[PDB]
């Protein structure tokens, strides 16, 4: 079981996750193409530039630059912001990207979908915490 933690669907019923099951014998590197295929329903992969953050126990970062996929070093964003999700829907209205200072995006949607951009800056502990 793996899911994206930085890209979601906006639907009539609420936020829907990108989830792939039956992955026990594969690492994130081995199925990142399948997540890109899922996203191609909703955006023009050949024109878009974005990041994919996959959770499978650990977190794994990838970049998809006009269809060319690469590994990104671990950036330590929590991708925690307690999100509400729904499991079923009838209409897609948009695609939601969680963007960061180091992970911008350039998205060309299909089918007149909205592009939603939400920022996160929260990172795991790195040896120093600051009272704000």
CSV table of N, CA, C and O in Angstrom, one decimal:
chain,number,residue,atom,x,y,z
A,1,UNK,N,0.8,-1.2,0.0
A,1,UNK,CA,0.0,0.0,0.0
A,1,UNK,C,0.9,1.3,0.0
A,1,UNK,O,1.7,1.4,0.9
A,2,UNK,N,0.7,2.1,-1.0
A,2,UNK,CA,1.4,3.4,-1.1
A,2,UNK,C,0.4,4.5,-1.5
A,2,UNK,O,-0.6,4.2,-2.2
A,3,UNK,N,0.6,5.7,-1.1
A,3,UNK,CA,-0.2,6.8,-1.4
A,3,UNK,C,0.6,8.1,-1.6
A,3,UNK,O,1.7,8.2,-1.1
A,4,UNK,N,0.1,9.0,-2.4
A,4,UNK,CA,0.7,10.3,-2.5
A,4,UNK,C,0.3,11.2,-1.3
A,4,UNK,O,-0.9,11.1,-0.9
A,5,UNK,N,1.2,11.9,-0.8
A,5,UNK,CA,0.9,12.8,0.4
A,5,UNK,C,1.0,14.3,0.0
A,5,UNK,O,0.7,15.1,0.8
A,6,UNK,N,1.3,14.6,-1.3
A,6,UNK,CA,1.4,16.0,-1.7
A,6,UNK,C,0.5,16.3,-2.9
A,6,UNK,O,0.6,17.5,-3.4
A,7,UNK,N,-0.3,15.4,-3.4
A,7,UNK,CA,-1.2,15.7,-4.5
A,7,UNK,C,-2.5,14.9,-4.1
A,7,UNK,O,-2.5,13.8,-3.8
A,8,UNK,N,-3.7,15.6,-4.4
A,8,UNK,CA,-5.0,15.1,-4.1
A,8,UNK,C,-6.0,15.5,-5.1
A,8,UNK,O,-5.7,16.4,-5.9
A,9,UNK,N,-7.1,14.8,-5.2
A,9,UNK,CA,-8.2,15.2,-6.0
A,9,UNK,C,-9.2,16.1,-5.2
A,9,UNK,O,-9.4,15.8,-4.0
A,10,UNK,N,-9.7,17.1,-5.8
A,10,UNK,CA,-10.9,17.8,-5.3
A,10,UNK,C,-12.1,17.3,-6.1
A,10,UNK,O,-12.1,17.2,-7.3
A,11,UNK,N,-13.1,16.8,-5.3
A,11,UNK,CA,-14.3,16.2,-5.9
A,11,UNK,C,-15.5,16.9,-5.3
A,11,UNK,O,-15.5,17.6,-4.3
A,12,UNK,N,-16.7,16.5,-5.9
A,12,UNK,CA,-17.9,17.0,-5.3
A,12,UNK,C,-18.1,16.6,-3.9
A,12,UNK,O,-18.8,17.2,-3.1
A,13,UNK,N,-17.5,15.4,-3.5
A,13,UNK,CA,-17.7,14.9,-2.1
A,13,UNK,C,-16.6,15.2,-1.1
A,13,UNK,O,-16.8,14.9,0.1
A,14,UNK,N,-15.5,15.8,-1.6
A,14,UNK,CA,-14.4,16.2,-0.7
A,14,UNK,C,-13.1,15.6,-1.3
A,14,UNK,O,-13.0,15.2,-2.5
A,15,UNK,N,-12.0,15.7,-0.5
A,15,UNK,CA,-10.7,15.4,-1.0
A,15,UNK,C,-10.5,13.9,-1.1
A,15,UNK,O,-10.8,13.1,-0.1
A,16,UNK,N,-9.9,13.4,-2.2
A,16,UNK,CA,-9.7,12.0,-2.5
A,16,UNK,C,-8.2,11.8,-2.7
A,16,UNK,O,-7.5,12.6,-3.4
A,17,UNK,N,-7.7,10.7,-2.1
A,17,UNK,CA,-6.3,10.3,-2.2
A,17,UNK,C,-6.0,9.5,-3.4
A,17,UNK,O,-6.8,8.8,-4.0
A,18,UNK,N,-4.7,9.6,-3.9
A,18,UNK,CA,-4.1,8.7,-4.9
A,18,UNK,C,-3.5,7.6,-4.1
A,18,UNK,O,-2.5,7.8,-3.4
A,19,UNK,N,-4.0,6.4,-4.3
A,19,UNK,CA,-3.6,5.2,-3.5
A,19,UNK,C,-3.4,4.0,-4.5
A,19,UNK,O,-4.3,3.8,-5.4
A,20,UNK,N,-2.4,3.3,-4.2
A,20,UNK,CA,-2.1,2.0,-5.0
A,20,UNK,C,-1.9,0.9,-4.0
A,20,UNK,O,-1.1,1.0,-3.0
A,21,UNK,N,-2.6,-0.2,-4.2
A,21,UNK,CA,-2.5,-1.3,-3.3
A,21,UNK,C,-1.9,-2.5,-4.1
A,21,UNK,O,-1.8,-2.4,-5.3
A,22,UNK,N,-1.6,-3.6,-3.3
A,22,UNK,CA,-0.8,-4.7,-3.9
A,22,UNK,C,0.6,-4.3,-4.2
A,22,UNK,O,1.0,-4.5,-5.4
A,23,UNK,N,1.3,-3.7,-3.3
A,23,UNK,CA,2.7,-3.2,-3.6
A,23,UNK,C,3.7,-3.8,-2.6
A,23,UNK,O,4.8,-3.3,-2.5
A,24,UNK,N,3.3,-4.9,-2.0
A,24,UNK,CA,4.2,-5.5,-0.9
A,24,UNK,C,5.6,-5.9,-1.4
A,24,UNK,O,6.5,-5.9,-0.7
A,25,UNK,N,5.7,-6.2,-2.7
A,25,UNK,CA,6.9,-6.7,-3.3
A,25,UNK,C,7.6,-5.6,-4.2
A,25,UNK,O,8.3,-6.0,-5.2
A,26,UNK,N,7.4,-4.4,-3.9
A,26,UNK,CA,7.9,-3.3,-4.8
A,26,UNK,C,8.2,-2.1,-3.9
A,26,UNK,O,7.5,-1.9,-2.9
A,27,UNK,N,9.2,-1.3,-4.2
A,27,UNK,CA,9.5,-0.1,-3.6
A,27,UNK,C,8.9,1.1,-4.4
A,27,UNK,O,8.4,0.9,-5.5
A,28,UNK,N,8.9,2.3,-3.8
A,28,UNK,CA,8.3,3.4,-4.4
A,28,UNK,C,8.9,3.7,-5.8
A,28,UNK,O,8.2,4.0,-6.7
A,29,UNK,N,10.2,3.5,-5.9
A,29,UNK,CA,10.9,3.7,-7.2
A,29,UNK,C,10.3,2.8,-8.3
A,29,UNK,O,10.2,3.3,-9.4
A,30,UNK,N,9.8,1.7,-7.9
A,30,UNK,CA,9.3,0.7,-8.9
A,30,UNK,C,7.9,1.0,-9.4
A,30,UNK,O,7.5,0.4,-10.4
A,31,UNK,N,7.1,1.9,-8.8
A,31,UNK,CA,5.7,2.2,-9.2
A,31,UNK,C,5.4,3.7,-9.4
A,31,UNK,O,4.3,4.1,-9.5
A,32,UNK,N,6.5,4.5,-9.4
A,32,UNK,CA,6.2,5.9,-9.6
A,32,UNK,C,5.6,6.2,-10.9
A,32,UNK,O,4.8,7.1,-11.1
A,33,UNK,N,5.9,5.4,-11.9
A,33,UNK,CA,5.3,5.5,-13.2
A,33,UNK,C,3.8,5.3,-13.1
A,33,UNK,O,3.0,5.9,-13.9
A,34,UNK,N,3.3,4.4,-12.3
A,34,UNK,CA,1.9,4.2,-12.1
A,34,UNK,C,1.2,5.4,-11.5
A,34,UNK,O,0.1,5.7,-11.9
A,35,UNK,N,1.8,6.0,-10.5
A,35,UNK,CA,1.2,7.3,-10.0
A,35,UNK,C,1.2,8.3,-11.1
A,35,UNK,O,0.2,9.1,-11.2
A,36,UNK,N,2.2,8.5,-11.9
A,36,UNK,CA,2.1,9.4,-13.0
A,36,UNK,C,1.0,9.1,-14.0
A,36,UNK,O,0.3,10.0,-14.4
A,37,UNK,N,0.8,7.8,-14.3
A,37,UNK,CA,-0.3,7.4,-15.1
A,37,UNK,C,-1.6,7.8,-14.5
A,37,UNK,O,-2.5,8.3,-15.2
A,38,UNK,N,-1.8,7.6,-13.2
A,38,UNK,CA,-3.0,8.0,-12.6
A,38,UNK,C,-3.2,9.5,-12.7
A,38,UNK,O,-4.3,10.0,-13.1
A,39,UNK,N,-2.2,10.3,-12.5
A,39,UNK,CA,-2.3,11.7,-12.7
A,39,UNK,C,-2.6,12.2,-14.1
A,39,UNK,O,-3.2,13.2,-14.3
A,40,UNK,N,-2.2,11.4,-15.1
A,40,UNK,CA,-2.4,11.8,-16.5
A,40,UNK,C,-3.8,11.9,-16.8
A,40,UNK,O,-4.2,12.5,-17.9
A,41,UNK,N,-4.7,11.3,-16.1
A,41,UNK,CA,-6.2,11.4,-16.3
A,41,UNK,C,-6.6,12.9,-16.1
A,41,UNK,O,-7.5,13.3,-16.8
A,42,UNK,N,-5.8,13.6,-15.3
A,42,UNK,CA,-6.3,14.9,-14.8
A,42,UNK,C,-5.4,16.1,-15.3
A,42,UNK,O,-6.0,17.2,-15.3
A,43,UNK,N,-4.2,15.9,-15.7
A,43,UNK,CA,-3.3,17.0,-16.1
A,43,UNK,C,-2.5,16.5,-17.3
A,43,UNK,O,-2.3,15.3,-17.5
A,44,UNK,N,-1.9,17.4,-18.1
A,44,UNK,CA,-1.0,17.1,-19.2
A,44,UNK,C,0.4,16.9,-18.7
A,44,UNK,O,1.1,17.8,-18.3
A,45,UNK,N,0.7,15.6,-18.5
A,45,UNK,CA,2.1,15.2,-18.0
A,45,UNK,C,3.1,15.8,-18.9
A,45,UNK,O,4.2,16.3,-18.4
A,46,UNK,N,2.9,15.8,-20.2
A,46,UNK,CA,4.0,16.2,-21.1
A,46,UNK,C,4.3,17.7,-21.1
A,46,UNK,O,5.4,18.1,-21.5
A,47,UNK,N,3.5,18.5,-20.4
A,47,UNK,CA,3.7,19.9,-20.3
A,47,UNK,C,3.9,20.3,-18.9
A,47,UNK,O,4.4,21.5,-18.7
A,48,UNK,N,3.6,19.5,-17.9
A,48,UNK,CA,3.6,19.9,-16.5
A,48,UNK,C,4.9,19.6,-15.8
A,48,UNK,O,5.7,18.7,-16.3
A,49,UNK,N,5.2,20.2,-14.7
A,49,UNK,CA,6.4,20.1,-13.9
A,49,UNK,C,6.0,20.0,-12.5
A,49,UNK,O,5.4,21.0,-12.0
A,50,UNK,N,6.2,18.9,-11.8
A,50,UNK,CA,5.7,18.8,-10.4
A,50,UNK,C,6.5,17.8,-9.7
A,50,UNK,O,7.3,17.1,-10.2
A,51,UNK,N,6.2,17.7,-8.4
A,51,UNK,CA,6.9,16.7,-7.5
A,51,UNK,C,5.8,15.7,-7.0
A,51,UNK,O,4.7,16.1,-6.9
A,52,UNK,N,6.3,14.5,-6.7
A,52,UNK,CA,5.5,13.5,-6.2
A,52,UNK,C,6.1,13.0,-4.9
A,52,UNK,O,7.3,12.6,-4.9
A,53,UNK,N,5.4,13.0,-3.8
A,53,UNK,CA,5.9,12.5,-2.5
A,53,UNK,C,5.0,11.3,-2.1
A,53,UNK,O,3.8,11.4,-1.9
A,54,UNK,N,5.7,10.1,-2.1
A,54,UNK,CA,5.0,8.8,-1.9
A,54,UNK,C,5.3,8.4,-0.5
A,54,UNK,O,6.4,8.4,0.0
A,55,UNK,N,4.2,7.9,0.2
A,55,UNK,CA,4.4,7.3,1.5
A,55,UNK,C,4.1,5.9,1.5
A,55,UNK,O,3.0,5.4,1.0
A,56,UNK,N,5.1,5.1,2.0
A,56,UNK,CA,5.0,3.6,2.1
A,56,UNK,C,5.8,3.3,3.4
A,56,UNK,O,6.9,2.8,3.3
A,57,UNK,N,5.2,3.6,4.5
A,57,UNK,CA,6.0,3.6,5.8
A,57,UNK,C,7.0,4.7,5.8
A,57,UNK,O,6.7,5.7,6.6
A,58,UNK,N,8.0,4.7,5.0
A,58,UNK,CA,8.9,5.8,4.8
A,58,UNK,C,8.3,6.7,3.7
A,58,UNK,O,7.4,6.4,3.0
A,59,UNK,N,8.9,7.9,3.6
A,59,UNK,CA,8.5,8.9,2.6
A,59,UNK,C,9.6,9.0,1.5
A,59,UNK,O,10.8,8.9,1.8
A,60,UNK,N,9.2,9.1,0.2
A,60,UNK,CA,10.1,9.1,-0.9
A,60,UNK,C,9.7,10.2,-1.9
A,60,UNK,O,8.5,10.3,-2.2
A,61,UNK,N,10.6,11.0,-2.3
A,61,UNK,CA,10.4,12.1,-3.1
A,61,UNK,C,10.9,11.9,-4.6
A,61,UNK,O,11.9,11.3,-4.8
A,62,UNK,N,10.0,12.4,-5.5
A,62,UNK,CA,10.3,12.3,-6.9
A,62,UNK,C,10.0,13.6,-7.6
A,62,UNK,O,9.2,14.4,-7.1
A,63,UNK,N,10.6,13.9,-8.8
A,63,UNK,CA,10.3,15.0,-9.6
A,63,UNK,C,9.8,14.4,-11.0
A,63,UNK,O,10.4,13.5,-11.5
A,64,UNK,N,8.8,15.0,-11.5
A,64,UNK,CA,8.3,14.7,-12.9
A,64,UNK,C,8.3,16.0,-13.7
A,64,UNK,O,7.5,16.8,-13.5
A,65,UNK,N,9.3,16.1,-14.6
A,65,UNK,CA,9.6,17.3,-15.4
A,65,UNK,C,9.2,16.9,-16.8
A,65,UNK,O,10.0,16.3,-17.5
A,66,UNK,N,8.0,17.3,-17.2
A,66,UNK,CA,7.5,17.1,-18.5
A,66,UNK,C,7.6,15.6,-18.9
A,66,UNK,O,8.0,15.2,-20.0
A,67,UNK,N,7.3,14.7,-17.9
A,67,UNK,CA,7.3,13.3,-18.1
A,67,UNK,C,8.6,12.6,-17.7
A,67,UNK,O,8.6,11.4,-17.6
A,68,UNK,N,9.7,13.3,-17.5
A,68,UNK,CA,10.9,12.7,-17.1
A,68,UNK,C,11.0,12.7,-15.6
A,68,UNK,O,11.0,13.7,-14.9
A,69,UNK,N,11.1,11.5,-15.1
A,69,UNK,CA,11.0,11.2,-13.6
A,69,UNK,C,12.4,11.1,-13.1
A,69,UNK,O,13.3,10.4,-13.7
A,70,UNK,N,12.7,11.7,-11.9
A,70,UNK,CA,13.9,11.6,-11.2
A,70,UNK,C,13.7,11.4,-9.7
A,70,UNK,O,12.6,11.7,-9.2
A,71,UNK,N,14.7,10.9,-9.0
A,71,UNK,CA,14.6,10.8,-7.5
A,71,UNK,C,15.1,12.1,-7.0
A,71,UNK,O,16.1,12.7,-7.4
A,72,UNK,N,14.4,12.6,-5.9
A,72,UNK,CA,14.7,13.8,-5.2
A,72,UNK,C,15.1,13.4,-3.8
A,72,UNK,O,14.5,12.5,-3.2
A,73,UNK,N,16.2,14.0,-3.3
A,73,UNK,CA,16.6,13.7,-1.9
A,73,UNK,C,15.5,14.1,-0.9
A,73,UNK,O,14.8,15.1,-1.1
A,74,UNK,N,15.5,13.3,0.2
A,74,UNK,CA,14.5,13.5,1.2
A,74,UNK,C,14.6,14.9,1.7
A,74,UNK,O,15.7,15.4,2.1
A,75,UNK,N,13.4,15.6,1.8
A,75,UNK,CA,13.4,17.0,2.2
A,75,UNK,C,12.8,17.2,3.5
A,75,UNK,O,12.7,18.4,4.0
A,76,UNK,N,12.3,16.2,4.2
A,76,UNK,CA,11.9,16.3,5.6
A,76,UNK,C,10.7,17.1,5.9
A,76,UNK,O,10.5,17.5,7.0
A,77,UNK,N,9.8,17.4,4.9
A,77,UNK,CA,8.5,18.0,5.2
A,77,UNK,C,7.6,16.9,5.9
A,77,UNK,O,7.6,15.7,5.5
A,78,UNK,N,6.8,17.4,6.8
A,78,UNK,CA,6.0,16.4,7.6
A,78,UNK,C,4.8,15.9,6.8
A,78,UNK,O,4.4,14.7,6.9
A,79,UNK,N,4.3,16.7,5.9
A,79,UNK,CA,3.0,16.4,5.1
A,79,UNK,C,2.0,15.8,6.1
A,79,UNK,O,1.4,14.8,5.8
A,80,UNK,N,1.8,16.5,7.2
A,80,UNK,CA,1.0,16.0,8.3
A,80,UNK,C,-0.4,16.7,8.4
A,80,UNK,O,-1.3,16.0,8.7
A,81,UNK,N,-0.4,18.0,8.1
A,81,UNK,CA,-1.6,18.9,8.3
A,81,UNK,C,-2.8,18.0,8.3
A,81,UNK,O,-3.3,17.6,7.2
A,82,UNK,N,-3.4,17.7,9.4
A,82,UNK,CA,-4.5,16.7,9.5
A,82,UNK,C,-5.6,16.9,8.5
A,82,UNK,O,-6.4,17.8,8.7
A,83,UNK,N,-5.6,16.1,7.4
A,83,UNK,CA,-6.5,16.4,6.3
A,83,UNK,C,-7.7,15.5,6.4
A,83,UNK,O,-7.6,14.3,6.8
A,84,UNK,N,-8.9,16.0,6.0
A,84,UNK,CA,-10.1,15.2,5.9
A,84,UNK,C,-10.1,14.7,4.5
A,84,UNK,O,-9.8,15.3,3.5
A,85,UNK,N,-10.6,13.4,4.4
A,85,UNK,CA,-10.7,12.7,3.1
A,85,UNK,C,-12.0,12.0,3.0
A,85,UNK,O,-12.6,11.5,4.1
A,86,UNK,N,-12.5,11.8,1.8
A,86,UNK,CA,-13.7,11.0,1.5
A,86,UNK,C,-13.2,9.8,0.6
A,86,UNK,O,-12.2,9.9,-0.1
A,87,UNK,N,-14.0,8.7,0.6
A,87,UNK,CA,-13.6,7.5,-0.1
A,87,UNK,C,-14.3,7.3,-1.5
A,87,UNK,O,-13.8,6.6,-2.3
A,88,UNK,N,-15.4,8.0,-1.7
A,88,UNK,CA,-16.2,7.9,-2.9
A,88,UNK,C,-16.6,9.3,-3.4
A,88,UNK,O,-16.6,10.2,-2.6
A,89,UNK,N,-16.9,9.4,-4.7
A,89,UNK,CA,-17.2,10.7,-5.3
A,89,UNK,C,-17.9,10.4,-6.7
A,89,UNK,O,-17.9,9.3,-7.2
A,90,UNK,N,-18.5,11.4,-7.2
A,90,UNK,CA,-19.1,11.3,-8.6
A,90,UNK,C,-18.5,12.3,-9.6
A,90,UNK,O,-18.6,12.0,-10.8
A,91,UNK,N,-17.9,13.4,-9.2
A,91,UNK,CA,-17.4,14.4,-10.1
A,91,UNK,C,-16.1,14.9,-9.6
A,91,UNK,O,-16.0,15.3,-8.5
A,92,UNK,N,-15.1,15.0,-10.5
A,92,UNK,CA,-13.8,15.6,-10.2
A,92,UNK,C,-13.9,17.1,-10.6
A,92,UNK,O,-14.4,17.4,-11.6
A,93,UNK,N,-13.5,18.0,-9.7
A,93,UNK,CA,-13.5,19.4,-9.9
A,93,UNK,C,-12.1,20.0,-9.9
A,93,UNK,O,-11.9,21.1,-10.5
A,94,UNK,N,-11.1,19.4,-9.4
A,94,UNK,CA,-9.8,20.0,-9.4
A,94,UNK,C,-8.7,19.0,-8.9
A,94,UNK,O,-9.0,17.9,-8.5
A,95,UNK,N,-7.4,19.5,-9.0
A,95,UNK,CA,-6.3,18.8,-8.5
A,95,UNK,C,-5.6,19.7,-7.5
A,95,UNK,O,-5.3,20.8,-7.9
A,96,UNK,N,-5.2,19.1,-6.4
A,96,UNK,CA,-4.7,19.9,-5.3
A,96,UNK,C,-3.2,19.5,-5.1
A,96,UNK,O,-2.9,18.3,-5.0
A,97,UNK,N,-2.3,20.5,-5.1
A,97,UNK,CA,-0.9,20.3,-4.9
A,97,UNK,C,-0.5,20.9,-3.6
A,97,UNK,O,-0.7,22.1,-3.4
A,98,UNK,N,0.3,20.2,-2.8
A,98,UNK,CA,0.9,20.8,-1.6
A,98,UNK,C,2.3,21.2,-2.0
A,98,UNK,O,3.1,20.3,-2.3
A,99,UNK,N,2.6,22.5,-2.1
A,99,UNK,CA,3.8,23.0,-2.6
A,99,UNK,C,4.6,23.5,-1.5
A,99,UNK,O,4.1,23.8,-0.4
A,100,UNK,N,5.9,23.6,-1.7
A,100,UNK,CA,6.9,24.1,-0.7
A,100,UNK,C,7.9,25.0,-1.4
A,100,UNK,O,8.0,25.1,-2.6
A,101,UNK,N,8.7,25.7,-0.5
A,101,UNK,CA,9.8,26.5,-1.0
A,101,UNK,C,10.7,25.8,-2.0
A,101,UNK,O,11.3,26.5,-2.9
A,102,UNK,N,10.9,24.5,-1.9
A,102,UNK,CA,11.8,23.8,-2.7
A,102,UNK,C,11.0,22.9,-3.8
A,102,UNK,O,11.7,22.3,-4.6
A,103,UNK,N,9.7,23.0,-3.8
A,103,UNK,CA,8.9,22.1,-4.7
A,103,UNK,C,7.8,23.0,-5.3
A,103,UNK,O,6.6,22.8,-4.9
A,104,UNK,N,8.1,23.8,-6.2
A,104,UNK,CA,7.1,24.6,-7.0
A,104,UNK,C,6.4,23.6,-8.0
A,104,UNK,O,6.8,22.5,-8.2
A,105,UNK,N,5.4,24.1,-8.7
A,105,UNK,CA,4.8,23.3,-9.7
A,105,UNK,C,4.3,24.2,-10.9
A,105,UNK,O,4.1,25.4,-10.8
A,106,UNK,N,4.2,23.6,-12.1
A,106,UNK,CA,3.7,24.2,-13.3
A,106,UNK,C,2.7,23.2,-13.8
A,106,UNK,O,3.1,22.1,-14.3
A,107,UNK,N,1.5,23.4,-13.8
A,107,UNK,CA,0.4,22.5,-14.0
A,107,UNK,C,-0.4,22.9,-15.2
A,107,UNK,O,-0.9,24.0,-15.1
A,108,UNK,N,-0.7,22.1,-16.1
A,108,UNK,CA,-1.6,22.3,-17.2
A,108,UNK,C,-2.7,21.3,-17.1
A,108,UNK,O,-2.5,20.1,-17.4
A,109,UNK,N,-3.9,21.7,-16.5
A,109,UNK,CA,-5.0,20.7,-16.3
A,109,UNK,C,-5.7,20.3,-17.5
A,109,UNK,O,-5.7,21.0,-18.5
A,110,UNK,N,-6.2,19.1,-17.5
A,110,UNK,CA,-7.2,18.6,-18.5
A,110,UNK,C,-8.6,18.9,-18.1
A,110,UNK,O,-8.9,19.2,-16.9
A,111,UNK,N,-9.5,18.9,-19.1
A,111,UNK,CA,-10.9,18.9,-18.8
A,111,UNK,C,-11.4,20.1,-17.9
A,111,UNK,O,-12.4,20.0,-17.2
A,112,UNK,N,-10.7,21.2,-18.0
A,112,UNK,CA,-11.0,22.5,-17.3
A,112,UNK,C,-11.1,22.3,-15.8
A,112,UNK,O,-11.8,23.0,-15.1
A,113,UNK,N,-10.3,21.4,-15.3
A,113,UNK,CA,-10.2,21.3,-13.8
A,113,UNK,C,-9.5,22.5,-13.2
A,113,UNK,O,-8.6,23.1,-13.8
A,114,UNK,N,-9.8,22.7,-12.0
A,114,UNK,CA,-9.1,23.7,-11.2
A,114,UNK,C,-7.8,23.2,-10.7
A,114,UNK,O,-7.6,22.0,-10.6
A,115,UNK,N,-6.8,24.1,-10.6
A,115,UNK,CA,-5.5,23.8,-9.9
A,115,UNK,C,-5.5,24.5,-8.6
A,115,UNK,O,-5.6,25.7,-8.5
A,116,UNK,N,-5.4,23.7,-7.5
A,116,UNK,CA,-5.4,24.2,-6.1
A,116,UNK,C,-3.9,24.1,-5.6
A,116,UNK,O,-3.3,23.0,-5.7
A,117,UNK,N,-3.4,25.1,-5.1
A,117,UNK,CA,-2.1,25.1,-4.5
A,117,UNK,C,-2.1,25.5,-3.0
A,117,UNK,O,-2.7,26.6,-2.7
A,118,UNK,N,-1.6,24.7,-2.2
A,118,UNK,CA,-1.6,24.9,-0.7
A,118,UNK,C,-0.2,24.7,-0.3
A,118,UNK,O,0.5,23.8,-0.7
A,119,UNK,N,0.3,25.6,0.6
A,119,UNK,CA,1.7,25.6,1.1
A,119,UNK,C,1.8,24.8,2.4
A,119,UNK,O,1.0,24.9,3.3
A,120,UNK,N,2.9,24.1,2.5
A,120,UNK,CA,3.4,23.6,3.8
A,120,UNK,C,4.8,24.0,4.0
A,120,UNK,O,5.7,24.0,3.1
A,121,UNK,N,5.2,24.4,5.2
A,121,UNK,CA,6.5,24.7,5.6
A,121,UNK,C,7.0,23.8,6.8
A,121,UNK,O,8.1,24.0,7.3
A,122,UNK,N,6.2,22.9,7.2
A,122,UNK,CA,6.5,22.2,8.5
A,122,UNK,C,7.4,21.0,8.2
A,122,UNK,O,7.1,20.2,7.3
A,123,UNK,N,8.5,20.9,8.9
A,123,UNK,CA,9.5,19.9,8.7
A,123,UNK,C,9.7,19.1,10.0
A,123,UNK,O,9.3,19.6,11.1
A,124,UNK,N,10.2,17.9,9.9
A,124,UNK,CA,10.5,17.1,11.0
A,124,UNK,C,11.6,17.7,11.8
A,124,UNK,O,12.4,18.6,11.4
A,125,UNK,N,11.8,17.3,13.1
A,125,UNK,CA,12.8,17.9,13.9
A,125,UNK,C,14.2,17.6,13.3
A,125,UNK,O,14.5,16.5,12.8
A,126,UNK,N,15.1,18.7,13.4
A,126,UNK,CA,16.4,18.6,12.7
A,126,UNK,C,17.5,18.9,13.6
A,126,UNK,O,18.6,19.1,13.2
A,127,UNK,N,17.2,18.9,14.9
A,127,UNK,CA,18.3,19.1,15.9
A,127,UNK,C,18.2,20.5,16.6
A,127,UNK,O,18.9,20.7,17.6
A,128,UNK,N,17.3,21.3,16.2
A,128,UNK,CA,17.0,22.6,16.8
A,128,UNK,C,15.5,22.9,16.6
A,128,UNK,O,15.0,22.9,15.5
A,129,UNK,N,14.8,23.3,17.7
A,129,UNK,CA,13.5,23.8,17.6
A,129,UNK,C,13.5,25.2,18.2
A,129,UNK,O,14.3,25.6,19.0
A,130,UNK,N,12.6,26.0,17.6
A,130,UNK,CA,12.5,27.4,18.0
A,130,UNK,C,11.1,27.8,18.5
A,130,UNK,O,10.1,27.6,17.7
A,131,UNK,N,11.0,28.3,19.7
A,131,UNK,CA,9.7,28.9,20.1
A,131,UNK,C,9.4,30.1,19.2
A,131,UNK,O,10.2,31.0,19.1
A,132,UNK,N,8.2,30.0,18.6
A,132,UNK,CA,7.8,31.1,17.7
A,132,UNK,C,7.1,32.2,18.5
A,132,UNK,O,7.6,33.1,19.1
